[PDB]
Each structure stands twice: as C-alpha cells, then as structure tokens.
Amino acid sequence: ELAELKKKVTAKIDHGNRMLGLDLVVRDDNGNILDPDETSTIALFKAHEVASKRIEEKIQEEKSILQNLDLRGQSIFSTIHTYGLYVNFKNFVCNIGEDAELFMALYDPDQSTFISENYLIRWGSNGMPKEIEKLNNLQAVFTDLSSMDLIRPRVSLVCQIVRVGHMELKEGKKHTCGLRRPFGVAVMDITDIIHGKVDDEEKQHFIPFQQIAMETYIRQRQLIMSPLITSHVIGENEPLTSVLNKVIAAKEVNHKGQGLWVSLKLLPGDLTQVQKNFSHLVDRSTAIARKMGFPEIILPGDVRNDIYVTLIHGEFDKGKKKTPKNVEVTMSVHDEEGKLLEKAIHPGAGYEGISEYKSVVYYQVKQPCWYETVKVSIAIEEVTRCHIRFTFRHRSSQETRDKSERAFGVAFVKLMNPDGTTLQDGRHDLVVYKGDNKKMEDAKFYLTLPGTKMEMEEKELQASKNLVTFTPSKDSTKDSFQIATLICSTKLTQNVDLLGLLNWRSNSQNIKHNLKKLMEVDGGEIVKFLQDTLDALFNIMMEMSDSETYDFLVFDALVFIISLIGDIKFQHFNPVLETYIYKHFSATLAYVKLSKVLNFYVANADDSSKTELLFAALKALKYLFRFIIQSRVLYLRFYGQSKDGDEFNNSIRQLFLAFNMLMDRPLEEAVKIKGAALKYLPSIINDVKLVFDPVELSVLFCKFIQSIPDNQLVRQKLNCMTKIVESTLFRQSECREVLLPLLTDQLSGQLDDNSNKPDHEASSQLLSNILEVLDRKDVGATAVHIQLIMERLLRRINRTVIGMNRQSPHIGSFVACMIALLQQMDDSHYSHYISTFKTRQDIIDFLMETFIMFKDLIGKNVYAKD
C-alpha cells in the first residue's frame, strides 16, 4: 500500500508540475531525491526518459478519457487473464406450483458449443427461494475466464431451469413428488456487458424467456371451415440445439410475466483478492465455478481434480409399445469392489455433493438433446480403482408402477484402461444392454463388460480375429447413446505415450514410434507430469546409451519439451523446473552425453530439414545448459574432484569452435537462424562462469565476436553485445584489458559507415553500459584501463556529435554519454594524456572543434524544456 500510494502521489505531482510547466521530481521510488547524489548520469537520463514517456502516456490517456471511457476497461481486462462472473439474482416473477432448479452457463452461438458449467439453486413452488439463505446473500463467482473467451465474436450466458415435482402441472393423474422435469432456457446477450464500460450493479436487466408448449387455450380452440386435427402434446419434445439457436437469434420473447432480475458484473482477478477487496460482491459463502477449459494463466498449484461427464444425445426406439420407455439415469459411483461412495456427484458448482443423481425426463422423444454435464470428484488414489454405472429405470404414471419398475437397461463406463490410461476426452457413444438383470448387478462380473466405444470396438475386433473367451453378446437392443467426456483433473492420463514414458520398460518395442509422436503433444497433458516425463527420458538416455538413433529421437523430443516449456504461457512453471532441478535432478554422466550430442548437432547443421529443429534448439539452449551444469556439478560433488573437467572444458571449447565455423559457413540459409543464435548466445554463460574459468570464456567470446563478419545484420549483433557486456563485465577482476579492446574495435567499426542513423541508439546503449561498468564501486582499481579508454574514447564521440548536430535524432542520449565521460575522468588522466595529444596545429584544431561543439550543444539545446 505504501509503495502504490507513493507511486500514484508522485505521478500526480509530476502531472501537476508538467501541466503548469514547473519542476518535476526525480527517482520515482524510494526517496525521490536520490538522483542528484552523483549516482549515475546514465540512470539520470533513464529516469528522465521514463518520466517523459509516462507523462506522454498519462496525457494521452487523460485526453482519451475526457471523451470516452472504453479503452480503460479493455486495458484493465487485458492486464491479466483471470476473471469471474457475478450474478445479482434479485427475484423470479412467475408462478408454477412445484419445486424449481436453476442452471446457468456459457454458450458460444458462433462456436455452437458450451463453455462453462452450471450451478443449481433451490427455489420454492411460487416464486420464493426454498432456502431463504440464498434469497438475499446470492453471491456467486464463475471463474476461468480470459481474453480468448472474451474475444469470442458473440458472448452470451445460457440460463436453463428444470422443475422438481409432478409429471403434470394440473389434475388428472397422480404423480411422484421429487422428479426432474425441464421447462425452458433463457439466454441474453452480454457482449457489451463483459467489456466493463459501465459499472452498474444496482441495475437489474429483465430477460424475456421462452420454453416448451404448456397451454392449449388460444392455439387450437378457434379453427373453422376445416376441422382436421390428429396430433399429440409436446411437453418436453424439443431438441436443444435448434431451440437454443433460435432463442439466441431472437431479440424479445412474450414470456407473459415470466422472468428474473439479474446483473452480471466482471471482477478481474481470482479468489485471493476478490474475497478481500470485492467483499461487497464476493462473500465467504460465494460459490466458485470451474469452467470446462484449460486455464490461460497456467499457474502452479491451480489444483483441479474435477471429472466432468457430459450427456448429449441418444437414440430411443419405441419398442413393443408406441411410447418410448421412460429413461432416467440412476447413476452411482463404485470402487473396484462396487461399493457406493457418498457425496461424489456435484450437479451444481458450490453446492454439496450427492451419492446418487438422476437425470431429466423428456416427453417420449426418439432423439432428445440433453446438454447435461455432471462433475465427479474422487480421491486421486481411489479414482484409479473406481467405476461408474448408468442404470436406466422406466418411470410410470402411477407411483406404484413408477417405483416398482426397476432399471430396464444398464449402461456403464470404465474410468481407466487396462494398459494404465484413463477415458480419453472427446465424444463417445454408448450402447445399452437390457433383458438379463443378474449379470449386470454383481460388481465383479461386469468389470470386463463393454461400456465404452473404443474398448467395445477393439473387443469385437479381437472376437472377429479370435472368437475365444470373447464373443459378441446379443443382449443389446435397438437404442444407443452418446456422451462427451472432458476430465479436467490433475492425475489423469489421456495419452498412451504418457504411460509409455511412465512404463517404457513394458513396451520398449514402440520406443521409436513414441519418440516420433512426442512432438505433437498438447501442452496441458505435458505440464501435468513434465517432471516425471523428463526424468523417464533421463533414465532412458542414461541406461540405454548404445543406440545413437534412440539418442537422436530422445534429443529431438527433449528439445520439443523444453521448447513448449519456454513458451509465453508457461513461465509460471519455470520456478517449478528450477526447484525440481535443485531437488530431484539426479544426472551424473548425462551432461557430457548431451554436450556431445549438441556438438554433433552444430557440426551437422548442413541439413535443410534440420533448420527449424536447430533453430528451436538454439532458442532453448538456456534451459538445457542449466541441466548440463546441474549434472556436471552433481558429478563433481559426488566424486569430489573430476579430472574429466579438462576434457569437458575442451568439449565446450570445441562447441565454441563449432559455432565459429557455423558462423563461417554461408548465411544464405540461416540468416534468421544465426541471428537468433547470436541473440541468445551468452544468456547462460553467466552461470557457466560459475563453473568455468572466466578469462577463457571472455577471450573465447572475444574471438567469436571478432570473427563475426562486418557485413550482415550489424544491429542484431549489437543488441547481442549490449546484453553481452551487461553481464559479467561487472565481474571485472579478469575481463578488463581484453573486453575493452573488443568494445573499442566494435565502436570504431560503428564510427565511420555513412549509414549509422539507426546505429545511434545501439551505440548509445553500448557506451552507456560501458560507462556504467566503469563507474561501479564494486569494480576496484580502473586507473590505467579508464586511461586507455579516454586515450581512444574522446575524439570519436566529438566527431560523431559534430556529424549529428541535427536536432531530430535522440542526441540527448549521447549528450549524457559524453558529459558522464567528461565528469568521470579525474584531472590526473587529463594531464597525462588528454593534454599529451599530437602536434600544436593538431591540438589547436582539437581545441577549436571542441569549442564549436560546445557552443552548438549550448546553442539551441533541444531537450523537452523539462
């Protein structure tokens, strides 16, 4: 709080200073007067320019916000990718007469797909809440939202309601109390609402609503001159796709007095701060919903052990009677011994779970649409030995026959696979079995019965090839079902290659096939058990070092894995990788193996098919060199001292010379590739200095850069050098008299080119940072080195500023450079060599040129008068 208040106060202070054109502040943080303490003219300018650009950004934002307030909301929402939905469910103006259940979610009409899950709310029979606790404290947060979900072309919230009570909402027949019957779905457009342009929590937008046919008072009574009506009643005979799309396209509905008051508010962030800063909208009793989708902010510890099962559609033949059988999914959770567990089904997000759950009922539909997603939560050890059954019970009109009739057909699904896998995500069909009632009840029997499409089809194929111990049963009927599975858990494995990494000892025959398939894997399943996969690869490359093609495919796979690690979506897990390196990384001799493999890689860089592979390898060199350094230090500490240090240093030097020849060979095919290679080249050599001799590393880099041609892509290599001296030149104890000549040579090449217009900024950053290292108090003695510097760092910059006296470029940078230079040197070195220049005519010319450039700098100085 102190830091943020200091920042905002200082920002508004400088805003006032500039708007009235008076003196501003320095050193934005921690003191604000620390700059005039001769700290750094470099940092002085840096503060100047950052303050100036902040001024420009603030004034343009002020000008934009003086007219419209649309950019601020979009920017705030784009700051992070973690948002939540809050509903202000005020009241329900309607009256039905039976218990009601609410189900709202997110559906994209353009994608024609649902996104989020649904939560249930108990409501009374006459527009009241059954639980008055939710009457007033109705605070709900629906998490898992990001920019990619907000970038949807049409964003709408789907709200469906299912009743609980009688089969008929009138007299005529007795019906069992406590059964599910859907009514209809309400959908509203929230595209403009989710943009956060206007924050109005009090406003309660009414939504018109449409549902299935329920009354026959005006539709049929008045029909004259042609009475011919032979039809039935449509109570629940609506496929959901067409009705949902029609409601979406619809703009207004004659609900005839039915609807509710709701307001949707977007609160950015997660439960960490919305439970503290958004307490007025997010209480402690707020329900939290996990959308069926991978998070955009893939942070560590985002624990999700939710198993989502979606019921979509299924064929239902009429059968012996013309009325299709009433189908209710009486499902339950069972273990390896078929024991029912309690509180395992969570139809609503934020509500208590139930041991058993039943589904909705339709009005004798051959092909009804369900859109029914349910969630399963089981212990990670227990879920490995769990199974789910789907018993379908025929429900009759009278309670006696409704409850007397048992499950006519039983379905089921295996939660695992015999090879170790689990149920793969995607659309799965179902086939039900009827008739016998004894073989489908004993738990130990149906453990090996067909319950999923993939296992059923593979079993029938095995029967076709070998009709021994497996024969296709005839108990199936003329119906089928279809399900959607999306298990967003943390311990599942929907990848045969995943277990293959886990248990390669069992099926090492397909090692080549698995290594080939390792490079198209989805990121989430990888990051789920990346640590285990990496180890397994380490063990494979350790114990099996005989096959070099195995080594090639393993290196390619690890390159792909570390590349996916390096993506912008997964910097959160990089600390996890660091910690796993520090705790479980047990490689001792793999460092030299990987070093030799990459030496082969660079020495064999001639293939055109190897282009992108080596490109990504050099992109991710940092992490692999981290692994190599860890393995080598582990070896050194295990054996105390290694005489293999000399040979591995020679290996690194051979890698250096391989890079030398890699740059020497023609660039026509590796322009971007070699540019990026130099771009990230010294990123890890910082930690290599911890393990190798700094003098040799520095001089090898000096030889490399002096070998870099003076013909192509100079600005890129100058950015490289910028980052180069930035690192470990502060480790100046052994890298002065060698690094300084290289800087001198590259700046001299920078000097006279007749095309150094974009070179000015690069050379500016260069000289800036070199002076930064020259001034550091953690350096020591720098007398003779600064002496040689000023021996060759004065006339050249004088000439450069003389050439670029034009006032359009960013001269003030070089102004700061030269002034820092002049102040930094003490009078002694001035007297020793700045005085000891060439002949009297030459020194007089020097003096007059200096006077000219001084008067030109002072003459019409072109700063921002601030």
Tell me which residue has tokens 């060599």: 833
CB 743 within 8 A of CB 725: yes
3-state class (DSSP) for residue 106: strand
Q: Give the CA radius of gyration of the chain.
A: 37
CB 705 within 8 A of CB 678: no
Which region, left, alpha or beta, applies to residue 350 given φ > 0 means left and ψ of -120 to 50 means alpha?
left
Cα separation of 674 and 720, whole Å?
12
Cα separation of 701 and 695, whole Å?
10
**Paired strand residues for 135:** none
Cα separation of 100 and 122, whole Å?
7
Which region, left, alpha or beta, applies to residue 829 given φ > 0 means left and ψ of -120 to 50 means alpha?
alpha
CA 72 from chain center: how many Å?
23
Cα separation of 450 and 605, whole Å?
52
373 closest CA partner among 451, 328, 453, 307: 307
CA angle 311, 314, 315 (to 5 degrees): 170
Run of H or E including 383: helix 380-383
Report CA-CA distances (Å) from 362 to 316, 405, 434, 686, 790: 11, 18, 20, 68, 90
273 Cβ contact partners less than 8 Å away, ≥ 6 residues apart:
none
Which structure tokens are listed for 853? Answer: 């450039």
391 Cβ contact partners less than 8 Å away, ≥ 6 residues apart:
329, 330, 331, 407, 409, 410, 411
Run of H or E including 433: strand 433-434
Tell me which residue has tokens 């020793």: 832
CA angle 829, 834, 836 (to 5 degrees): 105
Which structure tokens are listed for 714? Answer: 């100079």
Q: What is the DSSP string of 524-585?
A: HHHHHSHHHHHHHHHHHHHH--S-HHHHHHHHHHHHHHHHHHTSGGGSSSHHHHHHHHHHT-
Q: What is the DSSP string of 602-645?
A: HHTTT-STTHHHHHHHHHSHHHHHHHHHHHHHHHHHHHSS-THH
What residue ranges in 59-217 does DSSP mark as E strands?
A: 85-87, 92-93, 99-108, 113-114, 122-123, 140-142, 156-165, 179-189, 205-206, 210-211
CB 627 within 8 A of CB 682: no
What residue ranges in 661-733 does DSSP mark as E strands?
A: none
For residues 90-104, one letter each, b for 16 or more C-beta atoms within 10 angstroms of the residue's C-beta and e for the rest, the string is eebebebebbbbbbb
Cα separation of 411 and 420, whole Å?
22
CA 347 from chain center: how many Å?
27
CB 334 within 8 A of CB 387: yes
3-state class (DSSP) for residue 300: coil
CA angle 329, 333, 336 (to 5 degrees): 130
Q: What is the resolution of this structure in A?
A: 7.5
Q: Is beta strand 407-414 parallel, antiparallel or unpaired with respect to 433-434?
A: antiparallel
Cα separation of 714 and 560, whole Å?
30
Run of H or E including 515: helix 511-517
Say if residue 11 is exposed, middle or buried (CB neighbours under 10 Å; 0-12, 13-18, 19+).
middle
Cα separation of 657 and 704, whole Å?
8
Tell me which residue has tokens 């700098």: 857
Which structure tokens are listed for 539? Answer: 């063990």
Q: Count Cα neighbours of 173 within 13 Å in the Cβ-side half-sphere.
A: 11
CA angle 206, 209, 212 (to 5 degrees): 165
